[PDB]
């Protein structure tokens, strides 16, 4: 049981910083990804001009 | 000829510098913006939109 219960307490503290780490990172990417979109459209609106 | 010639001129003159003068006066106007872009790399808000 002691065993048992540090074994759980272990597995469930590693399984929320696992979660806490992918959902922040997928805040990154997401954040990231607007970066690339926003980029391209200014990127589309200056071969426009050029032309 | 050459009486005619002048005032016809300076009609022309006339109008082309009352033109100009405005011309040159307001070209300021074309002052706008370019819209650049720095990648916003820093950025790191919090989920609360209820303001929509």
Known sequence: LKDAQEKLELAEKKATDAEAD????????QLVEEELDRAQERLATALQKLE | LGT???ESLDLRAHLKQVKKEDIEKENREV????????????????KKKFEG
Do not use: H, T
């Open chain 2, 31 to 46: 002052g706008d913006w370019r819209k650049n872009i720095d990648a916003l790399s820093g950025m790191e808000g919090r």
């Open chain 1, 22 to 29: 992918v959902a922040s990172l997928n805040r990154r990417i």
């Open chain 2, 4 to 6: 005619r010639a002048k």
